[PDB]
């Protein structure tokens, strides 16, 4: 057959590449693609004859409207489910010369669906416009740009202080002016049981170009529940909240998102040693595979819906040992020394203490586990429980550290027979110790009188 015109009896294939993150028709060997298995694609042949100019003209007239293409659907349908390599490889047995509507028709809960799209077999090869390409490769786009969770714990160096979580989730684009509405939209947070689930004081916004704040009851309701190994908080948009979201996204773009702020609170003496992990998930539609019931998590442990990566806060124990240049074997002589703790900047002359509460003129020490003063006892020791790692803050490792990234002990009362210190004493709590619940061991040496 002639190479320049369409061969009605040509063998064809259609290969859909399903990737976690996201069109020439040619295979693109990298092409960064983390393949996604177990996703079903359905192709439906359209009622256009691509062996005729009129068939191509019908497609052109759609001006890329995929919903209008749906009006051309035949009853000729084929399906394939991706394997480990994320490919849905429709064969020559499954495809013929013509146009197809391609839709992702089964999607594991955690996976973002592809957008529907139309493909032709063959395509004119843009890399060689003298060729008809009968073996088409397509890399579909995600319908949602992402879901993300952040933590702000820079304000919480001492354990038990407030931590803020911010969850930001894509909103599906639906045909708002046509009457289409998101039918279900829930943001679920899997809460560590150390957080007070009854005191989250949520704030919900639609962010992007021009942000708005949504109203509880009117636009959403917060539903919390006890769980097995965690507790649970769901922000569930109401009919009006869903309407606002549907509209905002339609008039906006992919970066028009819901933003949920949760204000996590603790008992002051909370045992935060180690990692405090938080994860959220998005349920973006009313598909029956999302069986989450915000009021009945039952024994669920995995986050429902499309998950964020977890975010961590890391708090460590400090064990302070008090001694002296006299090195007495009777360690009880080093009891009764008192200390307070600050964030500080190490300097050539010691350290500059940072005021823990800038609202007042007095330079205040940190409140750590509800306490400000730590007194040696026993064998001249005291535990300071617990301090957030200096090198892990706001949900990320601080790759580079500076002299600003310190805590300081200040000796506020010397043990009997000893001097106070000349300077504050800088130290760090490192994530490598805190995340393993390993103590940070600091020795303070006193000068005898
Ligand atoms: Ca065929
Ligand atoms: Ca499910
Ligand atoms: Ca000094
Ligand atoms: Ca102050």
Residue numbers in the entry: 35 to 56, 64 to 490
Paper text:
A. oris (previously Actinomyces naeslundii genospecies 2) can express two different types of pili: type-1 and type-2. Type-1 pili mediate the first attachment to host salivary proline-rich proteins (PRPs) that coat the tooth, whereas type-2 pili mediate attachment to carbohydrate structures on oral streptococci and host cells. FimP is an elongated protein, approximately 105 Å long and 35 Å wide, folded into three IgG-like domains: the N-terminal (N), middle (M) and C-terminal (C) domains. In FimP, the lysine of the pilin motif (WNYNVHVYPK) is exposed on the hinge that connects the N- and M-domains, and is thereby available for the sortase mediated pili polymerization reaction.
A construct comprising residues 31–491 of FimP (FimP31–491) from A. oris strain T14V was expressed in E. coli, purified and crystallized. The asymmetric unit contains one molecule of FimP31–491. The refined model comprises residues 35–490. The M-domain (187–355) and the C-domain (356–490) are rigidly connected in line via a shared strand whereas the N-domain (35–186) and M-domain are connected via a hinge. The M-domain is stabilized by a bond between Lys-190 and Asn-319, linking two strands that run anti-parallel to each other. The C-domain also contains one isopeptide bond, formed between Lys-363 and Asp-487. There is no isopeptide bond observed in the N-domain but when superimposing the C-domain with the N-domain it is obvious that the N-domain also has all the necessary amino acids, Lys-52, Asn-183 and Glu-145, to form an isopeptide linkage. In agreement with that, we observe that the FimP shaft protein is stabilized by two disulfide bonds, one in the N-domain and one in the C-domain, the domains that share the CnaB fold. Four metal ions are found in the FimP31–491 structure and they are modeled as calcium due to the high concentration of calcium in the crystallization conditions. The fourth metal seems to have a structural role and is coordinated by a long loop in the C-domain, protruding from the S6 sheet.
